[PDB]
Paper text:
To obtain insights into the structural details of the CISSc contractile sheath-tube module, we performed single-particle cryoEM (helical reconstruction) of purified sheath particles from WT S. coelicolor, which had a homogeneous length for the contracted sheath of ~140 nm. The resulting map reached a resolution of 3.6 Å. Contracted sheath proteins adopt a right-handed helical array with an inner diameter of 115 Å and an outer diameter of 233 Å. Cis2 monomers consist of three domains and are well conserved in S. coelicolor and S. venezuelae, sharing ~65% sequence identity. The additional domain 3, which is located on the sheath surface, seems to be highly flexible and could not be resolved. The overall contracted structure of Cis2 is similar to sheaths of previously characterized systems.
In general, CIS are composed of a contractile sheath that surrounds an inner tube loaded with effectors, fitted with a baseplate complex. A conformational change in the baseplate complex triggers the contraction of the outer sheath, which leads to the propulsion of the inner tube into the target. Similar to the recently described sheath structures observed in AlgoCIS15 and tCIS19, the CISSc sheath is composed of a single protein, Cis2.
Author numbering:
A (entry chain A), B (entry chain M): 2 to 90, 249 to 526
C (entry chain H): 341 to 526
D (entry chain G): 438 to 486
E (entry chain B): 390 to 437
Write the structure that this text describes.
């Protein structure tokens, strides 16, 4: 500071603590067709009554209402709705809190409108590209309705390779009730998986893989999978919905579409997205600083505190904090040539946790 | 300085550090025809909305809009647009930041206007000559639409030898969607490769060869290449776009048109262009200097610091800095006869890195 | 009672004065809020800023949640020695202080006692400046160096009545690009 | 090996890549050996990469 | 703050303390005798 006249001056030293908070990952955006309502506007809904008052309820035989009802049935919190069109006879890039996007009513046009497979493939590829560009959202995909084994395994490899590590495909369709006619009919599993994800993120941490959850609300599956068929679909990124005699309908597999073995599991990707978003949001104060060792010490302290708080909840694999993470920011990683251009590195390394899929016992006999 | 009167004089000695910064290599210039807009003006675009507001969108069935959309789909940052003509029924030498030039809509005139092959060959040769004269930009070339094996291998050697080490040719065309009619149609791979290059330069360093990248928005190819056909096209500077059962559509080959084995790979040329541009921009202060050993020491220090900073990112092959580069500027390379005319040499030598193309295992059995 | 466009002439001067008052002059006025404004009538993306950053063009950017802020803190100079504004401001301050508070040294007997006194005064000033965190170095030995002895004052030079007192300092530069890694390790 | 190695193509080809490949192959071979599918009292006598 | 660097003292009015002297400096370019109390004490010592 500048001292030019006698008096008393009170100043605050910036040295202190600047905690970093997390972000909410329980928002989903559904794009579909509705009978009546706002057009090309991403409306916000948080309870069925709002959806009933805005977009109607169960009158045109569309898949948007069923998906929304299923999402709110599995413990959803808040949703975004986009209505492309409809009858009575999207700009998702501007939103920030969206964590997942779905297009529940797309196979309807394929079933009756005969929109071929090229249009569906192009739409899904565009959604995948948008998800990859945003770098924050995860896509949910469903296959065409009428297929069985030895067909989907073809459809995934010769027609819909997709990969891109930013998607999750759910094979079998779900038969659900409709009160408008009071009849059972088949719908894709689009909103139910999003609701299960939100429930898992609410009850437990985001690091828990949604592998064993009950699809509340369904009645049948119109298809049965044995152990061998699942063993044929497990190596590829195809999950399953299995019926167990005594436990009912449950999710099974918790995998993604990625050839690279680095991002095989969904929970790792979700946790990395959460960490990246938190770090990006809660760090902007560091730009345009004197760039001395005090700044390095402050950054190291903040990152270490955040990582310790994350580890104490059991989200990192290690008996001691020393074996769970490592943060490096010193003169070894910041040579004078690098600091000449005004650069900070702050290398960070963490050890995540992976779900247990195969449990093996021995049952040996010993003397 | 001159001292003639008593007093206090404050002077600054030039001895210090003068860091050299890099340049941005993620700008592409597209020349084509558009329905309406500015004529013969290199407009600057950074988002589709600007392109929609300026040059329209998907109304004349031209290849400029598709190429621009593909470029922005693959992670482009900023582009230049030149509109030669059009209907509703270039001066690229003045720009400096341009790193690559493309003419996406050239085969359209060949398809309907019947402009023969001589005009196309002359236009491509002129573009190649302009790229060579500039010494900073790299050209992207595409072949005529309807060809297969044993034809392109002829078209490359008996008609379009080209070489010149300043180009990259991409053989197969890409079938993409059009929302104006909502139909699939074939387009050359002009903007997609530029977008892939920009994405590779943004995510990783410019030294990484864009050999394994996924073409976002790519649906089909209308042609399939086996191992033998690729082995027939690999020795010549013809790259490929291959479909893999489980990974989708990916680039393959990352080579250029150059008979000289010194510039076989694209990444070496890109890195050399980057280094030459940086050195040329950040050295102009050395002209008209007293030309003593202090100047030699300063130049050596600056070049060594720049090379060390470049090497610490893993862009040079060597376990130690001594094995990665060498800079010589002393009395051995600057004899008195040479310094009489006022000349500085400052010999520089670097060791680049090359991509790994063939991976071989052994799997031997030993006691 | 109406909105109209004006150039940003006095606001940047006020921001500079505020930065010099609250903190030291060595802090670059890179992230400050332009109190008093309302709009900009223009928007800059990342690419356009990346095209204007290499040249000495600063920017005033609107951030969704932080408002209108200064951005870039650079000057018009091709020479890479004076790229940043804070270095120039600190050098001007040091030169003015030295010029004002040294005039008593002229017309002196010019013996080693004078050299010792000058060295002591300059060292005290530099230590006082360094203790506020305005110089890059863990120890005073790595932050500055002052030389005034018989090595830099040969008898031929002292014959004409000259004093040199070589001074060298190591300034601090602002941090512009912050990079994290977020790697996965066993 | 053929299925789980395709990511190595088109890499900068420095000693870091060699270290990564060696680590991956060694981990796979150790996991295979710990089930008793290789003849050797110690990992050093069972394989070499 | 514009008059303090030069040897100009001031008489300031404070809201709650009234009229008070302020600055206690002298007219001397040499930084050795900036303050008045040093000069007064040196004069006293020399006289004694």
């Amino acid at each position: 500071p500048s001292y030019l006249s006698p008096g008393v001056y009170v100043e605050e030293v910036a040295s202190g603590s600047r905690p970093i908070e997390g972000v909410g990952t329980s928002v989903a955006a559904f794009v579909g067709l509705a009978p009546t309502g706002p057009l090309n506007e991403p409306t916000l809904v948080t309870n069925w009554t709002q959806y009933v008052a805005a977009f109607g309820d169960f009158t045109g035989g569309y898949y948007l209402a069923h998906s929304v009802y299923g999402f709110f049935n599995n413990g959803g919190s808040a949703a975004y709705v986009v209505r492309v069109g409809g009858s009575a006879e999207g700009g998702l890039e501007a939103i920030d809190e969206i964590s997942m996007v779905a297009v529940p009513d797309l196979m309807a046009a394929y079933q009756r409108g005969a929109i071929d497979l090229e249009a569906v493939k192009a739409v899904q590829l565009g959604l995948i590209a948008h998800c990859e560009l945003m770098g924050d959202r995860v896509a949910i995909i469903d296959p065409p309705p009428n297929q069985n084994a030895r067909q989907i395994r073809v459809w995934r490899q010769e027609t819909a390779g997709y990969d891109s590590k930013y998607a999750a495909l759910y094979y079998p369709w779900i038969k659900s009730f409709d009160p408008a006619t009071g009849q059972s009919r088949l719908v894709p599993p689009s909103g139910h998986v999003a609701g299960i994800w939100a429930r898992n993120d609410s009850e437990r941490g985001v690091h828990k893989a949604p592998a064993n959850e009950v699809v509340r609300g369904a009645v049948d599956l119109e298809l049965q999978i044995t152990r061998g068929e699942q063993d044929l679909l497990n190596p590829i990124g195809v999950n399953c919905i299995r019926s167990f005699p005594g436990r009912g309908i449950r999710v099974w597999g918790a995998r993604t579409l990625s050839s690279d073995p680095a991002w095989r599991y969904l929970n790792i990707r979700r946790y990395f997205n959460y960490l990246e978003e938190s770090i990006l949001i809660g760090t902007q104060w560091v730009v345009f600083e004197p760039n001395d060792h005090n700044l390095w010490a402050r950054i190291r302290r903040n990152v270490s505190a955040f990582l310790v708080n994350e580890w104490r909840n059991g989200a990192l694999f290690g008996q001691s904090p020393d074996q769970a993470y490592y943060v490096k920011c010193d003169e070894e990683t910041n040579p004078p040539e690098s600091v000449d251009l005004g650069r900070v590195v702050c290398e960070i390394g963490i050890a995540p946790v992976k779900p247990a899929e195969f449990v093996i016992f021995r049952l040996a006999q010993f003397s």
